Design a protein around this ligand. Sequence first.
Ligand SMILES: [Cl-]
Length: 345
Amino acid sequence: DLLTRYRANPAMMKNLKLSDIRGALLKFAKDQVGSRFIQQELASSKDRFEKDSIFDEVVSNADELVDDIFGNYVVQKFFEYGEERHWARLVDAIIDRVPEYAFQMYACRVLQKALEKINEPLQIKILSQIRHVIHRCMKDQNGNHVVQKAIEKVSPQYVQFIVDTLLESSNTIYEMSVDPYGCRVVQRCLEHCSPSQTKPVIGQIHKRFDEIANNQYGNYVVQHVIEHGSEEDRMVIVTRVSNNLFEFATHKYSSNVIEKCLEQGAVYHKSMIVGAACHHQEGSVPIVVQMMKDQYANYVVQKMFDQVTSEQRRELILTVRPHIPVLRQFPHGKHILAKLEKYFQ
RNA sequence: UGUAGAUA
Ligand SMILES: [Cl-]
């Protein structure tokens, strides 16, 4: 009834302390008002022993609190930097049900905060439970954040088991790249793993490149390869893009992949794309012109002009300079050449 | 004129 009292007149118990909660800790932590009370005390208190007073109750009730809408914040308090002395004890209170906690919307925030804060030995202890559920966890609306946090905050060698999951079967990298949650995992791996680790992952992506490039999620995976891959990877992608410039530029998702080449590419990469754009193609219109008539590829043409050298832009201008009035009437064509007005003055 | 993650 301490909670019921305190909820009634909060001002009347302005001298309430953490050490006063004792057995009431479970009831407080699962209450909107009471959990805000614990939290504000934990953050404002400068008494190490007041903070310690509730910790035995937090540990005793860990399982009931980690996935409570209000209690999860109370558990997270003991994973913060002022609480090292409690990390090992708190990890051990939750370690055995980590494989379930990773899928739960409140408990997974506790796992993310622990990985965010605790030392590498304890991280590895937590990862050892993730091992059991890792493939399903990567695709999960909750679990993918726990995996993303592991990749960002643990040294590369201790997440090799996550890379071998991305590589467990022929189709796994495709399956993850096209998944709305698994694709974030591929992306962090590209950002944080060693080249030893990323090289097979990028190799797998390349095998089904066209598909992944035009997927509503895979196109970000390909964009991360462009940004974080090797020179040789960029050349493979630019070479594929250049040789199918029209197909890539006219589809919704893959058109962002060309734009990404045009941003992260060296002068000689851009020259391959400008060259394909301006190629004769026998009697048909040059690809750059056709692209300007397209709903997605006109943004690609605009990005070409913004990113290439003056010498490269000169070839685009000498290729588009006849076909203009035709383009003026085409759907939104008035707008498209308006934005290119600068370069035709 | 065109794309993306779970807390009071
Ligand atoms: Cl394969």
